[PDB]
Amino acid sequence: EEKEILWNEAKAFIAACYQELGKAAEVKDRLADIKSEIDLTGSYVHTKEELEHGAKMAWRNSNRCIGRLFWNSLNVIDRRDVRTKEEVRDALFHHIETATNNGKIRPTITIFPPEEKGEKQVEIWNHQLIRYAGYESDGERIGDPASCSLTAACEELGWRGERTDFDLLPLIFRMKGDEQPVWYELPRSLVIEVPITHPDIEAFSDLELKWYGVPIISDMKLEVGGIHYNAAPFNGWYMGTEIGARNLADEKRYDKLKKVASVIGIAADYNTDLWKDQALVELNKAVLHSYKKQGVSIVDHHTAASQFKRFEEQAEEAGRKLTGDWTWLIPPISPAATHIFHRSYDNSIVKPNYFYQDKPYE
Template sequence: MTPILDEARAFIEQCYQELNKSESDMMLRLQQIEDELKTEGTYTHTREELVHGAKMAWRNSNRCIGRLFWNSLNVFDARDASTEDEVFGALERHLDYASNNGRIRPTITIFRPSQRHQPDIRIWNHQLIRYAGYVEDGQYIGDPHSIAFTKKCEGFGWKGQGTHFDVLPFVVQIGDGPPQWKEIDLNLRLEVSLRHPEFDWFQDLGLKWYGVPIISDMELKIGGISYKAAPFNGWYMETEIGARNLADENRYNLLPKVASCMGLDMSRMATLWKDKALIELNIAVLHSFKEDGVSIVDHHTAAQQFRLFEENEKSADRDVTGDWTWLIPPVSPATTHIFHKEYDNTWNTTNYFYQDRPY
């Protein structure tokens, strides 16, 4: 058997078993796939296989703490999109549907797979909504993580306002054609202004963050078939924003500012000023999202949900894989059961994988 047939067989056997399909249905489907591979060198997933495969890939995602909800993933089949405008339209539909006025819906949009005689569709954005980053007189404005991509966008003719929170455009490339960009409609940009339940001055910092984290630069693999454009989202865990995006020194680096506004003693590390500022920053994120009715989960609840996921998988006689370094939350990890466990970091082949940037 070829490697792709090996992966296809393993996927179909598991998929059809989980969908309670008959042995005869499975054997017939495997024969169809084998015949298709002989003539075409690839095979096409049915919609049912695509939907369940995307869900399985989420369930197999070693670095995701939110896998309890894998079976609730909403799948948009956009394999018929063939032009940049059609791709832009599908991305806008995804944003609108996933945002859902704040009641975030886990969603994936899957574009056509890599195949001979058809150019790949690639989304240049790391996330569909992301803030621009600039360097001016040696000072960072906005998100330093986005500097390289921002420069590419500016080279295409896009121009931001030069603020800390300029939303970058969609950038899509089909095959070797020139990348196309499109400004994201203001009505699709679900954003939350950050404030604190106790510190009135916090709102004066002018901070905000977008509501839906839609990863758009990873490769989805299902049964040996590669989908290089398959943006997907769940909802935020507050530490992703409050302990990483806004707090990391190589990102917005806001801990010194918050600590200063709190009047903390920053003369030495032993005062734990960073820890105090970090907690309040996370409190502000949770408070603001919840007050605005935008879905978010705190890291303690997320860890409890992951424990339930582990129990469910054990009941289903499936092994749980995991990357411990990613599963532990960046705030108070020792207060969760995850910190005290070991996980098998084997990557199942139906999964989401990192891929080289298209630029």
Template sequence: MTNTNDMWEEASTFIYTCYEELGLCREAAEARLLDIQREIEDSGTYGHTQQELEYGIKLAWRNSNRCIGRLSWQSIRLVDARDAGSAEEVAECLFQHIRTATNHGKVIPLLTLFAPRTPEGVDPVRIWNHQLIRYAGYETSSGIVGDPASVAFTKEAMKLGWEGNGTDYEVLPLVIEIAGQKPVYVPIPKDLIMEVDIEHPDYPEMESLGLRWYAVPMISDMRLEIGGIQYPAAPFNGWYMGTEIGARNLADPFRYNKLPAVAKVMGLETTSEASLWRDKALVELNVAVLHSYRKNGVSMVDHHTAANQLAKFEEREAEAGREVTGNWTWLIPPMSPATTHIFHKSYSNQVKKPNFFHQPAPYTKNQDDNLPEKKFDQKEEANPALATCPFHG
């Protein structure tokens, strides 16, 4: 159940901040708050205006402590889908999100917003997927095929009737749950899915590994909170930072674990750790990822440029009189972190709102919906930098 006192306090803080930063007078903010107060008294909640939502999602990005790509926080676009009430309507909105965000590789930061949580605590819409586009994972007698991070969700999709092919890079269907109804799976049209085959400019043998990844990280399982209103379905995206794919998704031992295979095609000696074969393979895999995305015209940022962009963001925030908060363990890139300024400084991890919050997957039990951030888990995929922060994948 919603605590209306807390909602009112959160609404007041947000409206004053929003109106001030938009250059609107305090009298206008106070008049708006009177309307909000009446709404809360009458219904136990209130509705945001389009302007409030458009600025609220920008603030949520700016406040994302895990995101290295916050320099572009003002660029995110909003699609207001609060009226989508059926699984079919939600699916169509998600298809349009994928189409618009991908933009033939010129990625557009985008957030599609569905109906908020009711005063009774009911979520009108939930998207079960961690990301709108992600690869399936299958447990087999000889090990896991595909993405190990997707094994649990893949099982749930199959329980609903989806039939996968059991291959390494198979895109999962969307799973949509409407309040009071059974969840349904909806395959994503293949023409909406942009993928990149990974090749290396100097090691053509790497192409034989058949590595690939999807173009855009679109996070779909986080809860957005703006002014005390909870939006449990608010998929959003930025663009990838190369290391999220090359140093994590394809490289982590508990993900695709491709470093040994990369080392082999490079002809590296792997019998001794002192040869630093893992490091050499890691660098070249990341070179391949950056090269392949660039060759295919897909937006991506390297981790050094991303770190420089964060430094610029920090400068601009200081000029605006705002402290930059951050989660150091997530801001440092997973490759060569000591070569960036981030490694050598500290950040307050204070959580500001509006913001994105983790919430339990509908198919899991005994998880806490109120934690602003999970404790750092090395087995968890790095968030996307609107350059899966929440904004890189």
């Protein structure tokens, strides 16, 4: 009766999907062909139209995402035809290149073959396609601590990092039938990076900070109508606070706040001086300034929250129930200066959606 889950989800997804596309008359013929298809083969195949709209629905349903205003303009690349490692690798390369778009990031998702009967066809190990290695031994911490386990796994497979603070991890993924993943160094010409400078404080460049242009989340499962697309990397553009308030500020990541305090010329001695708060603002100002100056898409949390308010209004005008996760939608800098903080949201889980899945490493 594992088959029955799939028939139930397909009924719910096709009905809602064809309704939004003005194809409601076709739902009944398409469901019959679907019902025959699972009886015979155990699964069914989405049309390009269903797959595209389902990926957009999944984004629209992501309770934790503040950028959902633009769900309908998601650029869906259908790569369910890939069978080899070189095709996986080149499709990932292509995703980076087309999503990057010389700095004007296009929200893009590349969709690989789904799980057949729980068996993955392609298993991506990267958390993001572009992200820095992290090392910790002999008391020395180098790079991004969030990447330490993946970096250790990559170096079991013959890869070796330069041990800078910004080593690019290679693409790492495993094919069905293979016992071990393969890895491929990223072509540096494809990866845009942004040096972090400050608009007013020339000494900020002494910190030698940088970040990559495009966050491409590559380890979540896209679930559309009972079909599990475990390999479906997607990207938007950064909200500035993700870099300035978390990646570069967490003690547990790059932990730069105390160095930021020094170069902006304030003491880091007393809690009552709010030096962490002041450093966070100047760092976050630097990130936004630096991405703008290089021509790489980014959004500040105020503009992002205004956009999300329009998403809330678009939802009701459309008759669609709104779902959201208050604890993730508030930004980590001045959350009470956004409207999100002052209302409530139903955190109900609606499908299609993106979901966590177990890491193939530890």
